[PDB]
Amino acid sequence: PGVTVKDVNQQEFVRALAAFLKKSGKLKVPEWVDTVKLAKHKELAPYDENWFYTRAASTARHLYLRGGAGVGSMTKIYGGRQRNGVMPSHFSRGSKSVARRVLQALEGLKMVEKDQDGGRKLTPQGQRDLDRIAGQVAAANKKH
Amino acid sequence: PIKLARVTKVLGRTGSQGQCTQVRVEFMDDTSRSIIRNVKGPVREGDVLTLLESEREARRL
Amino acid sequence: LVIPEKFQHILRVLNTNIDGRRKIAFAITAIKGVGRRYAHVVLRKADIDLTKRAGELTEDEVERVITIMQNPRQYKIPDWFLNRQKDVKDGKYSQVLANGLDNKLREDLERLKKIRAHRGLRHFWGL
Amino acid sequence: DKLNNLVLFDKATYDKLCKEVPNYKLITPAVVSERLKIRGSLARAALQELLSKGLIKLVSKHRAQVIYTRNT
Amino acid sequence: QSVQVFGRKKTATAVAHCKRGNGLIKVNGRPLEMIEPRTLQYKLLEPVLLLGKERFAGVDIRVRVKGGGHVAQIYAIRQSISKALVAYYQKYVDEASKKEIKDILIQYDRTLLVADPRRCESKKF
Amino acid sequence: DIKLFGKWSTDDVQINDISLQDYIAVKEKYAKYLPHSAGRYAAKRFRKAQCPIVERLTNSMMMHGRNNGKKLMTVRIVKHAFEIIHLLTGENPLQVLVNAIINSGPREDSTRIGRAGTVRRQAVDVSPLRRVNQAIWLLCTGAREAAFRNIKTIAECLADELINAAKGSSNSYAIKKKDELERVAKSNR
Amino acid sequence: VGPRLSRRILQQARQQQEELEAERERTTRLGP
Amino acid sequence: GDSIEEILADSRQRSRAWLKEDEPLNFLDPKVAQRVLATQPGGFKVSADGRLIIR
RNA sequence: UGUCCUACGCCGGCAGGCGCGGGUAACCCGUUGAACCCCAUUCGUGAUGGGGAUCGGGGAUUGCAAUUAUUCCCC
């Protein structure tokens, strides 16, 4: 009977989860959170200055949906199209350092833990926290 | 005056490049008049056409 | 909202005219030697809202932006972010904006000419 | 010739929009931009500002096109 | 009692499993009001909006979709759902009900029970 | 009831031209939820006359290179244009589109002929299917050439073009093109 | 259908049947 | 084997499968294996009398 | 397609370095998490946040060797 993450709109889920992680205040924000482009195919810095919270929320959601992912999988996932000048565009992965830092910060929250078969996955704390905030979002959207 | 008339039978593709169609055309208000017209576009039997000036008949070899 | 009573249509920054009817992160980009990315980081280091227009900044924020502009390293702007990192004559991490860029290009080309390397001779044969 | 749409509201423009916009039978950033000589960002921001006061009815919203109408 | 059918577009293939239920309809664990393009949302709900929710009130369907693109996946989803319903009312409910269902599904959209035989052409030397 | 976009009723839609009744397919058999159907509508001659006319307009918005294949963009444009049309005139946009097509189709055109150096124009009649085709094409061209470099969205210019073509006013691009085509065909009897 | 599409469809159906049928330390010491 | 066409004949790969699509295919039907195939589906002169000429 | 394809961990902001595994292959990269597309934000008809050429500086990688810029990254 409990509403699942998969039963909830994903963008509102990411927004509410980022708000929750900013409210908790236990995330280890790096010093260079202001002075970095998220990948080499970007051109400007993100306007949303709390981009670390949204990226961590998206990473937690992705590791819920498909666990066992490492840093390279996160670089593949947030990769995009690089416009190579007057040359044809190509696909370029995301920056490895941002993926490593969001993974290690979510791990320091006790939200995310390593596994024997590979990279990172969710804790039971992570699963029930996502279920609780998904219940909150479903109450705020479906019941209104 | 604006006139309306049904296609009865298509005579065949006409024009230098086959861009027109010569066709048998009869009115609905008086189903006695019967004229030859040439048209641009795909036509079949049962199509009805809007004729601006319904006096002269089309003529192409 | 509406116009404030102190909206400055044209600013005079580093002997450069700045159109006040523009966003601040691109009005700073209008200065030579500053692009979009460097303007964005210098305005974020000054703790200034980027939704807010350039032409009605007070003088204090303009002066603090300028003091970050000619002094990047003192405000945690990274070393790899600068225009001229290792200057050939006196190696120091610097950021020349208005007249320093034009000048330093001029003596760069002059140094290339005076040693008669291929690049200087070719570029001054180009005109 | 060259358009000279305004970037922040003048007094007369603000007054005439606050007494003329909630009855156009078409409220969209483009049309208010072209009939008030307003750059599109300021016209947009004025439109959610007027929606905040309840004077303007939204009928659909998109990342490319948001469209309004009068209340009654 | 339960059935399992498939539907397809160019390379997008969906498999639908149909069982007794209460009217919970799922693709990849998600509801049909959650599958990514809302612009083609009515393409998902077409058997629902034609056949009514009362005829979906006693059935649970679960669809696993893989391949293709977004539009092709949606078309495979709706084809699999319609074929699953046709199969259920053929195997375990009376024949005549399946007759009017299959009929109205045909004169609305003929592709709801037969695949489109269109695929990318090869290039030869 | 089947309604376009979950809102738009097709029962009150009527065609005022007897020539275009069998070639404008908006009725209870052709009433669809969406203008996206992906049917094999050009594999045989005269098949595309049975297409819903909103789907024909949607397929004809996918023009000029960059917009090729972007059908979800064009159904978004069609939806927003229909909302703008309704919120402007207060009447159903399907009837507005039908009237715009009826007033937009050229009834008499010209054909370039020649034997050697003598190139002339011969007046011919236009079939109803080609009437529908040139009406749709001229409406799309009018909207596209109308906006292209201004604050006006493609949806607003498209809505204005269908509204002014249903009225028959001379401000529309399609009406002006039809007028000059009929004037040339009348001067080349 | 053809070989490749049918192969993918068969694998999808098999996996779906298995995951509908779905819903510790290995015995190092042999004796009870 | 003993079929007429095989006897009267002019005399990775094995994992390829063909479905057939009629009613919708029920994978849970006990008789579905009939609709799943394992292989690909699908000189003389006559005289005036009509007798053939052999040489 | 692959004994150069690469998973994973650490460092760096990025090119990239270090270690430890799999793959002679429908077994590993790889449930090939691709781009257009969809959603939301900013931009407002302005050679402009469109367009990217040509240039100045710095870092890295492949090679006996990069100068007449091998290539990649940042400003």
Swiss-Prot record, chain D:
GO cellular component, one term: cytosolic small ribosomal subunit
Keywords assigned by UniProt, alphabetized: Acetylation, Cytoplasm, Ribonucleoprotein, Ribosomal protein
Source species, domain of life: Eukaryota
Modified residues (N6-acetyllysine): K2, K11, K19, K25, K53
Molecular function terms from GO: RNA binding; structural constituent of ribosome
GO terms of biological process kind: cytoplasmic translation; ribosomal small subunit biogenesis; rRNA processing; translation
Positions bearing N6-succinyllysine: K11, K53
Broad class of where this protein is predominantly found: cytoplasm
Compartment list: Cytoplasm
Membrane-spanning parts: none
Functional description taken from the UniProt entry: Component of the small ribosomal subunit. The ribosome is a large ribonucleoprotein complex responsible for the synthesis of proteins in the cell.
Family to which this protein belongs: Belongs to the eukaryotic ribosomal protein eS25 family.
Subunit structure comment from the entry: Component of the small ribosomal subunit.
Name of the molecule in the record: Small ribosomal subunit protein eS25
Organism: Homo sapiens
From Swiss-Prot, chain E:
One Pfam family, short name: Ribosomal_S9
UniProt GO BP: cellular response to leukemia inhibitory factor; cytoplasmic translation; maturation of SSU-rRNA from tricistronic rRNA transcript (SSU-rRNA, 5.8S rRNA, LSU-rRNA); ribosomal small subunit biogenesis; rRNA processing; translation
Keyword annotations of the record: Acetylation, Cytoplasm, Nucleus, Phosphoprotein, Ribonucleoprotein, Ribosomal protein
Cysteine disulfide links: none
InterPro entries: Ribosomal_Su5_D2-typ_SF, Ribosomal_uS9, Ribosomal_uS9_CS, Ribsml_uS5_D2-typ_fold_subgr
GO cellular component: cytoplasm; cytosol; cytosolic ribosome; cytosolic small ribosomal subunit; extracellular exosome; focal adhesion; membrane; nucleolus
PROSITE patterns cross-referenced by the UniProt entry: RIBOSOMAL_S9
Positions where N6-acetyllysine occurs in the chain: K53
Major location (coarse): cytoplasm
Subcellular location: Cytoplasm; Nucleus, Nucleolus
SUPFAM superfamilies from the UniProt entry: Ribosomal protein S5 domain 2-like
Molecular-function GO terms, alphabetical: RNA binding; structural constituent of ribosome
Similarity field: Belongs to the universal ribosomal protein uS9 family.
Quaternary assembly: Component of the small ribosomal subunit. Part of the small subunit (SSU) processome, composed of more than 70 proteins and the RNA chaperone small nucleolar RNA (snoRNA) U3.
Protein name: Small ribosomal subunit protein uS9
Swiss-Prot record, chain F:
Signal peptide: none
Glycyl lysine isopeptide (Lys-Gly) (interchain with G-Cter in SUMO2) crosslink, residue number(s): K32
Record keyword Iron-sulfur present: no
Gene3D superfamilies documented for this protein: Ribosomal protein S7 domain
GO cellular component: cytoplasm; cytosol; cytosolic ribosome; cytosolic small ribosomal subunit; extracellular exosome; focal adhesion; membrane; nucleolus
Sequence positions bearing N6-acetyllysine: K32
Positions carrying Phosphoserine: S127
Pfam family, one: Ribosomal_S7
Cellular compartment(s): Cytoplasm; Nucleus, Nucleolus
Homology family: Belongs to the universal ribosomal protein uS7 family.
PANTHER family, per database record: RIBOSOMAL PROTEIN S7
Designated name of the protein: Small ribosomal subunit protein uS7
Organism expressing this protein natively: Homo sapiens (Human)
Gene from which the chain derives: RPS5
Swiss-Prot record, chain H:
Residues recorded with modification Phosphoserine: S3, S11
Organism annotation: Homo sapiens (Human)
Family: Belongs to the RRP12 family.
Tissue: Weakly expressed. Expressed at intermediate level in testis and ovary.
Protein name: RRP12-like protein
Localization terms from the record: Nucleus, Nucleolus; Nucleus membrane
Gene: RRP12
